[PDB]
Each structure stands twice: as structure tokens, then as C-alpha cells.
Design a binder for this molecule. Structure first.
Ligand SMILES: Brc1cnc2[nH]nnc2c1
Ligand SMILES: Brc1cnc2[nH]nnc2c1
Ligand SMILES: [Cl-]
Ligand SMILES: [Cl-]
Ligand SMILES: [Cl-]
Length: 348
């Protein structure tokens, strides 16, 4: 009784392996899932190649958001004719059985799959550097004035390997992306990767992606999310454990500062007071990235002790870049052009 029997109760297309669409696509299987709908692997008979097909939910709000996604993908792909800025390619789109379907090149698995494959030991610092450099080049591309595109949902799951053994990547899922000055949501980004200005209800720009990236890079090396909040209050407190209380010039303009913080008569800010007898977080800024990363103790959890490509100097450079990506102030947070110039990327 949903979509004349083609949909489940959650607006998704009921995927059947081997179904052929439009005398062109043979549906192999489901390969991904999301809030947007589903992704399937299919073979395009006409072009005689494998593709991934993202099936948007048969639901107006989701259709209308995916129309924005289509426009940003076609816009990016036309400024990336050489396909060298690490953004997935929208081959074409169509309506089928009342689902917007977007056809992409077939890609390998994502960076989360890669971490899980190491049993969350984390990938090497050399491989992290390759990912960071590609990622920064991609954000530089997004920042070109004709695009000014904010991805808004960078996470390990939305960065895909081109090929499962090689290190080339592409960013996918511009399903919540917007352009500078075309911002339409306040609840954005995945929580672990969510920036302070978004937690604070403040206006945001492309710099929220660089925040997400700094979280991602740490997690790729340690194996675990840097700020693993269960809800927004716990997310902001986890950030404060590592970075301290946010500067007053930020909190004074934050419409949601009172959700997490409290201003004292002298105008300084602290965390909201907790119920008497309840200790739950480390005191502000005492959980140091220096120790999260194991800079002088053999890498995260000491697991890198004795390996090449993991020197103390290597780690200090890494930490510095990460901390610059995690600047509380969006206006001084490091920007893609300067991140590429960081000493973490030199040499070899
Ligand atoms: Br290829 C590919 C795979 N997964 C995606 N999610 N959103 N866009 C995507 C493109
Ligand atoms: Br803020 C901040 C957080 N963690 C650190 N580790 N080493 N220096 C640091 C500065
Ligand atoms: Cl999702
Ligand atoms: Cl290596
Ligand atoms: Cl924690």
C-alpha cells in the first residue's frame, strides 16, 4: 500500500537483486544506506560499465534536498573536467518509480570500512598524510569563488577509496551541501564531526568542513572518533575537554551558548554547573591531543612504537596542523590553501 507496493514503510525503494530498469540498468545489490535513501550497485547495459545508483526516498523533503545535491554535483563536475579535485562524478540522473535516482561511477569502500579493516588500530601516519592532502586539495576546490560549496557532512563514511588497495579518494554525498549564503539548516553535520559554531547555533561558512576534516584525520590515525558525543551537550563537553572553554568573543555572540555555558559577572564563561556530586568530564583543556596522539610515546596507545614514518617530529607536525584545523575561531581556522603549505606535507 506504499507506492503501489514498490516502497517500504520508510519511503525507500524495495530493492530486488536482478531487477532490470528501463532496459538499461541491471540491479546487482544494495551497497549502502543512509538517511537519504539507498545506494545500489548496478550494471549499465548501454555504457557497458558498473555504476552506483543512489535511490532517493520517495518523499518530498528528500526529493527537494537531492535536487540541490544534483545542482551542486553538476556544478562541481563541470569545473573539474580533468576529475582531479577528488569529488565524485554524477554521470546522470532520472526519475524511476517516483524515486529520484543519481548515477555515479562505481567506487570502492569508504574510510570507515578501511578503519574497521585494521580493527580500529588506525592507519599509518603516511597514509593519513595522503588522505589529508587529497582532502585539503578538495576543500580548496570547493572554496573556489564560482563554487563556494560547503559539504556539511564530512565523515569517514563519505570519503571513498577509488580502489580498495590504493590511496586515491573521492568525496561523496553532497546531500546536505549548500553554497555560501544559501544556508538553510541549523542542525547539520554528523555529531562527532560537528563544529562549535554549528553547536552554538551561529552562522557558519566553509570553515565547518575544515573542522570536520581535523576530526576525521585524528580518527583515521588513532582508530576512534576524537569527540564522540552522545548528544549535543555531551559533544560540546568532549570538545571542551581537549580544547578548553571557547573564547568569550565567540560565546558572546553564540545564540546557544547558554545550552552549554554560563557567563560570570566578570564576563568570563564556564561550563554550566552540574548536579552536586556528579563528575563526568575531564577539566577544561586537560585531555591533551599531545597525549591522545602519543606524540612522545609511540603513537596512539603506543601502537606505533619503533615504526618508521612515525617520528616524534612527524607527530608534532601532525598535531600542529590538527590544532590549526580545530581553531575555535572560524575566521582564523586554517584554510585549505595554507593547510597545503604546512610542514606536515613537505618532503619525500
Ligand atoms: Br559513488 C557514491 C556512493 N555513495 C554515495 N552517497 N552519496 N553519494 C554517493 C556516491
Ligand atoms: Br588547545 C591544545 C590541545 N591539546 C594539545 N596537545 N598539545 N598541545 C595542545 C593544545
Ligand atoms: Cl545518512
Ligand atoms: Cl606506510
Ligand atoms: Cl572520551
Amino acid at each position: 500500500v506504499y507506492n503501489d507496493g514498490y516502497d517500504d514503510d520508510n519511503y525507500d525503494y524495495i530493492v530486488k537483486n536482478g531487477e532490470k530498469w528501463m532496459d538499461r540498468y541491471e540491479i546487482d545489490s544494495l551497497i549502502g544506506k543512509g538517511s537519504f535513501g539507498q545506494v545500489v550497485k548496478a550494471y549499465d547495459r548501454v555504457e557497458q560499465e558498473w555504476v552506483a545508483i543512489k535511490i532517493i526516498k520517495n518523499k518530498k523533503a528528500f526529493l527537494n534536498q537531492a535536487q540541490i545535491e544534483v545542482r551542486l554535483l553538476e556544478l562541481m563536475n563541470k569545473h573539474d573536467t580533468e576529475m582531479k579535485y577528488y569529488i565524485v562524478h554524477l554521470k546522470r540522473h532520472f526519475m524511476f518509480r517516483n524515486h529520484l535516482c543519481l548515477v555515479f561511477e562505481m567506487l570502492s569502500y569508504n574510510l570507515y570500512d578501511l578503519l574497521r579493516n585494521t580493527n580500529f588500530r588506525g592507519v599509518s601516519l603516511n597514509l593519513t598524510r595522503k588522505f589529508a592532502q587529497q582532502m585539503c586539495t578538495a576543500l580548496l576546490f570547493l572554496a573556489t569563488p564560482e563554487l563556494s560549496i560547503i559539504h556539511c557532512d564530512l565523515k569517514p563514511e563519505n570519503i571513498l577509496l577509488c580502489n580498495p588497495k590504493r590511496s586515491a579518494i573521492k568525496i561523496v554525498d553532497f546531500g546536505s551541501s549548500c553554497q555560501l549564503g544559501q544556508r538553510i539548516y541549523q542542525y547539520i553535520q554528523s555529531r562527532f564531526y560537528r563544529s562549535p559554531e554549528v553547536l552554538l547555533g551561529m552562522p557558519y561558512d566553509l570553515a565547518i568542513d575544515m573542522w570536520s576534516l581535523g576530526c576525521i584525520l585524528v580518527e583515521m590515525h588513532t582508530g576512534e572518533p576524537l569527540f564522540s558525543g552522545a548528544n549535543e551537550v555531551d559533544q560540546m563537553n568532549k570538545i571542551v575537554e581537549v580544547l578548553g572553554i571557547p573564547p568569550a568573543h565567540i560565546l558572546d555572540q553564540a545564540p546557544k551558548a547558554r545550552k552549554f555555558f554560563e557567563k560570570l559577572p566578570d564576563g568570563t564563561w564556564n561550563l554550566k554547573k552540574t548536579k552536586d556530586g556528579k563528575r563526568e568530564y575531564k577539566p577544561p583543556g586537560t585531555r591533551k591531543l599531545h597525549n591522545i596522539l602519543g606524540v612522545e610515546t609511540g603513537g596512539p596507545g603506543g601502537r606505533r612504537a619503533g615504526e618508521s614514518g612515525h617520528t616524534v617530529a612527524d607527530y608534532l607536525k601532525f598535531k600542529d596542523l590538527i590544532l590549526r584545523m580545530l581553531d575555535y575561531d572560524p575566521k582564523t581556522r586554517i584554510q585549505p590553501y595554507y593547510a597545503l603549505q604546512h610542514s606536515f606535507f613537505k618532503k619525500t
